[PDB]
Amino acid sequence: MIPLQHGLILAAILFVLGLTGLVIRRNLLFMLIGLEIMINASALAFVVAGSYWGQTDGQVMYILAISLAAAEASIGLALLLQLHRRRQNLNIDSVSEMRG
Amino acid sequence: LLKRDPLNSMMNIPAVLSRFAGKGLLLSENGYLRWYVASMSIGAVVVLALLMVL
Amino acid sequence: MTITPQNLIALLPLLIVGLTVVVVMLSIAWRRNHFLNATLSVIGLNAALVSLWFVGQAGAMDVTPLMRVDGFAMLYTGLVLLASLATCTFAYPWLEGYNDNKDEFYLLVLIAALGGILLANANHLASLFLGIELISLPLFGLVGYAFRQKRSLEASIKYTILSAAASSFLLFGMALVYAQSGDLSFVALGKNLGDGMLNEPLLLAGFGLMIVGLGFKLSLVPFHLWTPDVYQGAPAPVSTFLATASKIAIFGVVMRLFLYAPVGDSEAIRVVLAIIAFASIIFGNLMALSQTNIKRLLGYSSISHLGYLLVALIALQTGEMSMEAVGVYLAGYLFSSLGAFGVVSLMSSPYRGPDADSLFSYRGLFWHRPILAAVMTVMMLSLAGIPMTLGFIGKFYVLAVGVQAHLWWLVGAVVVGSAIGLYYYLRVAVSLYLHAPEQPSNWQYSAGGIVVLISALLVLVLGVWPQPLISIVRLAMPLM
Amino acid sequence: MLLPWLILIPFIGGFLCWQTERFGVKVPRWIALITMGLTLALSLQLWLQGGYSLTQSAGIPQWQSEFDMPWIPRFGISIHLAIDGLSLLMVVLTGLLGVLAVLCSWKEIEKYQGFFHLNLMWILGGVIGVFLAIDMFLFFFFWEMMLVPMYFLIALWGHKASDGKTRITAATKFFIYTQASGLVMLIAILALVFVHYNATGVWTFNYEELLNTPMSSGVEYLLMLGFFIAFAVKMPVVPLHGWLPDAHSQAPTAGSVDLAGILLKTAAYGLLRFSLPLFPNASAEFAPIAMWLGVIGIFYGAWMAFAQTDIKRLIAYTSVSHMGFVLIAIYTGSQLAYQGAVIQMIAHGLSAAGLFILCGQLYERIHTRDMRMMGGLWSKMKWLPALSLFFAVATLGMPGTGNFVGEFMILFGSFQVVPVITVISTFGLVFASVYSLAMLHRAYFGKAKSQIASQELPGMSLRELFMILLLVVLLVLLGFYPQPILDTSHSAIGNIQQWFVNSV
């Protein structure tokens, strides 16, 4: 009764919202937050695709996606803690000296 | 009129073009992570539009 | 399908690398011994190579709905394992200079080798996604292993953020493809489309998002800007492992995906990949023109060489020798980048600390270390495509595959980018034999030295005499 | 079974020249002389036992010697060597030039001289290899593998008075020109092999089987154009000549690298053996363009030579003009012009070798190459200005030297084919006399224009003088008796000419 198209469009909306939140923010924490939004949107799209076909594979890919999201959130917050404890500044544009 | 080898200079023109193009392309490697994410999204837009056109 | 005992006899490198991970981890939990844990890592990787020989005694079979093991998979597994072994060998003097925990580096290197093996045997979207994450996140750890170093922390943050974004793009594309196809197997990606309806927009857009993620992973233009910063900031053995193992494993699974997907011979994806290959070759060669840093220069070089690989990939279904060309090119590129980043590793070893500069200064290298200058020159000529080297054999293979498939724009791009490459590679080599104005004693440094000399001897011998490697790659056919 | 050894002897000689560096610094020059004399004597033996004066043109392919061993059997690639009269003349020429190069790089007492000898023999063995190979991939391999040694001994061993950046720039320019053109030739070779595989089913790189390749006119034109661009960089043909004067000027100041690498033109041989037999129709359509490029090369090289203040750049531009003559000769389709082109190639090699050796000796005597800094050198040197006068007279085209025989036989055949181009080229000979007399008047005649030209310069060493006199004697013998050379090259020249004119 629910269209697959509507669930896919909802996942796409959340994905592009996470992408623009990733781009527009100088603070690294909001960049990590936008990354979490994008990966949650991708997992939602996999759930919609799996539930449309009546298959278990969508929830399995969802489980793999949230395992990835947990590990990436852990690593990114470790890197953010390192940046804050070595520079006392979460500005990502200051971490830019390698260029050319 | 032909003491400085004009044909040699005209054949050396592609080296000048290559140096100018490389110097222009190296400006996009500014080191900003936000621009790197922006360029990834721009390339995603270009790839998706090209695939939808064909 | 389920698991048989013979399926376990078609799984040994994965189990060997996983058991090496567990054993090294428990040995770290026992005590913090750099020598013993590094040795356990290299014995585990060597045993995985011997396990590859043992499964070469066995046949080719589909071990899961996920995995498929054939000679294609064994060839790419061997390339990944050789890259990992070289990385550990270069990492030991570097980690000897590193005044913190050292064996976590080996644990992450082994875990990334496990992900490379998974990508080498992947026949399924779930396995491809998992292998990509399994080579990516240990590289998050390894690129910023020296997180107190400001350049390494910068490279870690850049690679972590950008690879998380690319993983999101790839996952979204896989979800859209599964929404269309209804099956995550590679062979079913386009099976439910017939009568010329192969160009369905949802399948194409899903493949486009996967192309964005994979081309980030392959440093393809315009997902390439991370490459010089991440290459320069990362530790030099980590740069070696990234440039060799990650790109080889991801391009192998990309080769398999475009081989068994029925949507692989759509004209739209072929044209988009042709544009990406053209731009990658030209942009990498042009951007490496005025580089005084060897690591950034090798990043741009990696961009151009993956463009050549993409040119070989485009001629898959039209031609026949495309996968053989990819194998020969991957062997030559593996040995060349191994030697190049190996010299970068040993001249940057031991690790001098987070505050000291890691600048290379290759100018005048012959007058204080002649043999490493010779090996750097040999690999510079190999990446240029000089006929006395196996890099030319790969260039000749991709040129033959572009001529056979009549890809004349890509052939001209190969020639022009080759000329620009000649300029910057020969500048690097003649700088090695210049005069420097002004400016070890273990056996693991000698092990890294003999590794780069062995790679040079292999690339020179297979440049003059390429037939053994050609016959090695040719027998590695997959289950068609 | 001497052609595999004809390529292997320079390689092993250079390798052992590098190896014997531990035994001394004065040692590897003797090993270099030994291996170059061995190669020259083996080539002379194969000439004397060849019987080229008594063989008739029996249709391409026709070789005196042949050898085949499978190198890359997956691609059907083999080490396939062969020799006939023209190829043997070329290999004897590079053997003699390599002997002269070794004798010219004498008393170079310095560290890493063994590597200089190793690079020299790699270049010479490579030139022999491209002169002998009849497998297309093998020919291209040999074509492109002189490039690394030539690049390294230009950039590292070059003209030491100039800045190291200038030598590196000249070496990189030469490498980029020749290797890009070689890659274009590789593309043409691959396309030809694939076309033969599609039209027949047999996959090969053998030249004798690729001759009978049915193809359209445009595809044949494109393959010919790739081959021609590869040969036109190395010929040199304008405007692809620009690498040559800087490569000569930034060559090592002994004057041996010019003889070893440049002063034998493998491009004319490549055109004769591959551009005309494989693509005869395309060469026939391309002939007016190549002829007018040759005329432009003649006059542009003459005007360029007159404008120089450097002697070495002047001689390089004389080489450009003479090769314009040869390029006109090759596309005539005339047997007389082909034989004249062979004589002109040999005479240009000898005369330019003499000119470059004399210029190197003059530079070691006066420590400058600027013609505004000298004059009146006839009263200061004992042998150099008169030998330079002879060699400027020779490259001027004077009868009694082989340059006249080659040039005028080219012009006789060309006037039988193309009269107007012949007329313009003879006025190019007037231009040649003009620049030769200009160089003689600027260098050796008049009053001293500086302080270094006002002193009694040291005399000539006996080895340098004797090999210059050997070049003089060979040039005079070529001018007065060119018949053995014509009888040697007649069968190969006639076979190429008959294949070219019976296919159109």
Ligand SMILES: CCCCCCCCCCCCCCCCCC(=O)OC[C@H](COP(=O)(O)OCCN)OC(=O)CCCCCCCCCCCCCCCCC
């Ligand atoms: C007649 C037409 C038909 C036949 C065409 C045949 C094509 C192949 C043969 C001709 C090739 C011509 C190449 C011309 C440039 C040669 C290289 C050169 O001159 O390099 C010197 C220059 C460095 O000089 P420098 O001042 O030291 O640099 C600043 C830093 N110090 O270097 C630089 O500035 C950078 C050099 C970059 C690499 C060289 C340029 C490559 C461009 C593509 C070449 C492929 C052919 C493209 C079409 C050519 C025209 C038809």
Ligand SMILES: CCCCCCCCCCCCCCCCCC(=O)OC[C@H](COP(=O)(O)OCCN)OC(=O)CCCCCCCCCCCCCCCCC
């Ligand atoms: C910038 C530096 C590099 C130089 C440029 C890069 C290479 C450019 C090559 C352009 C080729 C254009 C071909 C146009 C038609 C393609 C499609 C087609 O219809 O092909 C025809 C034909 C295949 O049809 P088939 O019947 O199977 O072949 C039998 C042939 N009788 O096709 C064939 O048979 C194959 C035809 C191959 C043609 C020769 C390719 C190489 C030519 C030499 C190099 C390019 C020209 C010189 C350099 C330019 C300036 C740098």
Ligand SMILES: CCCCCCCCCCCCCCCCCC(=O)OC[C@H](COP(=O)(O)OCCN)OC(=O)CCCCCCCCCCCCCCCCC
């Ligand atoms: C940054 C620097 C680099 C980038 C900028 C520089 C430019 C780079 C690219 C340069 C090369 C461009 C492409 C050249 C090849 C074009 C091929 C082509 O259009 O082929 C069409 C046609 C194919 O043959 P076709 O007639 O289809 O055969 C089947 C039935 N007969 O062909 C024919 O029928 C024959 C066509 C012959 C003429 C076309 C080739 C011209 C080559 C010009 C250079 C060489 C000129 C001669 C030598 C000069 C002195 C060295």
Ligand SMILES: CCCCCCCCCCCCCCCCCC(=O)OC[C@H](COP(=O)(O)OCCN)OC(=O)CCCCCCCCCCCCCCCCC
């Ligand atoms: C029309 C029908 C009749 C045709 C035949 C009769 C007319 C032609 C007669 C031409 C006579 C030219 C005489 C030139 C003698 C120059 C001698 C000389 O010393 O010149 C000065 C200079 C010397 O060089 P350098 O050593 O550097 O000295 C320092 C520079 N002052 O050297 C120079 O500056 C070089 C001077 C070069 C002169 C070149 C002459 C070419 C003649 C071509 C004739 C073509 C006839 C047909 C023309 C086309 C008709 C359609």
Ligand SMILES: CCCCCCCCCCCCCCCCCCCC
């Ligand atoms: C009904 C009685 C069955 C007895 C035997 C039961 C077990 C047989 C099959 C064993 C399969 C083991 C699979 C292990 C996979 C490990 C993968 C590790 C990856 C790193």
Ligand SMILES: CCCCCCCCCCCCCCCCCCCC
């Ligand atoms: C096919 C490979 C070609 C390049 C090989 C490079 C290594 C060769 C062995 C080392 C040679 C070093 C020579 C240094 C000479 C320096 C001379 C300086 C004064 C002119």
Ligand SMILES: CCCCCCCCCCCCCCCCCCCC
């Ligand atoms: C900035 C660098 C640009 C390099 C461009 C290199 C171009 C090389 C020449 C390509 C020629 C392609 C010709 C294609 C003809 C196709 C004809 C099809 C007929 C059916």
